[PDB]
Amino acid sequence: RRVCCVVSGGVYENVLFFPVVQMLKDRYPGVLVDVVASARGKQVYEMCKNVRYANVYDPDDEWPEPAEYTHQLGVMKNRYYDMVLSTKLAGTGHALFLFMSSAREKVGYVYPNVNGAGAGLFLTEMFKPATTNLADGGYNMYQDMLEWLGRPAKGVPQQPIPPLRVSISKKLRAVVEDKYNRAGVEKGKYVVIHGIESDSVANMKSRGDDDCLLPLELWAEIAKEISSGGNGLRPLFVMPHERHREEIEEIVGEETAYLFITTPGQLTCLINDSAGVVATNTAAVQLANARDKPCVALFSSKEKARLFLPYVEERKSCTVVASATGKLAGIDIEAVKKAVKDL
């Protein structure tokens, strides 16, 4: 049996799709499951053990010229999928794109009332509202429709497969991680800092207002007491996922020895070679919490129940600090450094 996923969005709303893929490969064993996503999102599928090969068609534009449209259909259809499960909240136009792919079981999401509520007759199992806010709840409908719906298959087959369990190929684990690490200070005993500025870092597609960045002054105040003490004594990794050659010249986290790297969504290995991580609500949170990798998440407030379900990851290792004011760029940075100084 062949399966195709049409997950939409960038990185943070695509890295959370691994549970669904694992549940697929667990319920129906020996299933070739391919995926189509956006250019920025396909980058995530270079660290997995289920998908056959990814692709890139839909940032889900409005016009896209009617030859790149057909050819896309002309490559979905001519491999004979069976259940093309989808996302992106199909209305009545995008439902036809699933329908023309002559599979057997078309399951997806739909708009509640807005954008031509619709949902069409030519579908199956259309469900809950659109904007897809919460994380690790996420596709929450999917981890129920694929659970024991049919037959003597055991009672719900391991309800929500273990949380993100991304693997790292030892080739990428060694060569590129080492080369970028040792470019500058490196001991495998440092600390990653992610939220800096706003070009395309992860942006989370859902946080909206906070977690996009900090004013880089709080980061300097944190970092000046990070390496202070023989705990790490290595870590000055401001880790700017930006055009930071446009930013490195303004690291007021004084440029004396604050190192820096450019990365795609490959930084999972760089996390796995750190001695921790401290960042705002971003892909780094889920990536660090996937492995042991004791993390420190700093998002706005009380969004934990949306973006961070496994409050106790391993030993309540990953700890979260909120902001009583609600805006991320105000926090008890003193207590933040207090919590961070232990790891």
Next chain:
Amino acid sequence: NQRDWVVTKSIWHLSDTAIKSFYTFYAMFTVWGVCFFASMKASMADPFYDSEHYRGQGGDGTVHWYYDRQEDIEATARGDLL
């Protein structure tokens, strides 16, 4: 011939003649039957199409072989099984 035009502002006179290859349009095609000499300049060595920095011989093979990524995901699954 050598007609002598007395134009109204200068001192011309001309002389012309008509010429055309009679039938040697056959002989030149016969000489351009030197494409039967396209065999000495083909048995010569190939520049790099036989070089060690080349493997894959289609029109998109070397360029779009590019799916050792799937095999690498499978090797990742196998290493996880180990």
